[PDB]
């Protein structure tokens with residue numbers, strides 16, 4: 001049994017809710033929240049900008065030190081950093097950004113990072129300002145992630161379309 005409440009069950013392991021991932025993280029304090037990161041861990045906008053704002057920029061300060069030591073992530077890659085006030089850990093995952101022309105096949109590699117964690121609160125990778133079709137992102141999630149994933153979707157319109165169209 002876990003703390004997550006109000007989710008619709010899509011599969012054995014994937015759950016979805018119309019929610020504010022920031023507000024959901026603040027309530028649950030999950031072991032892992034996933035960030036929709038870029039390779040530079042520059043948390044300017046989208047989910048990353050919202051998560052970072054909720055940490056009062058501490059996520060960005062930590063991320064800048066990580067990049068100064070390790071250099072950029074790979075598209076499809078990830079790193080584990082602090083969850084600050086939101087979670088124990090933040091798994092920063094880089095999905096392909098279609099608005100940069102990145103290979104959408106890298107979306108499966110991105111989701112494979114989730115399998116290193118038993119339970120996660122996450123957004124749909126490559127959705128929103130990363131330009132991918134969120135319906136496609138949810139299909140790749142269900143077909144790739146084997147651990148227990150709680151997906152948060154703020155836009156009620158998109159949430160309803162994802163549920164109604166789910167095979």
Ligand SMILES: NS(=O)(=O)c1cc(Cl)cc(Cl)c1
Pocket residue numbers: 020021022046047048050128154155
């Ligand atoms: N992707 S997100 O969680 O940052 C998000 C999306 C919308 Cl449409 C509104 C808010 Cl307040 C937050």
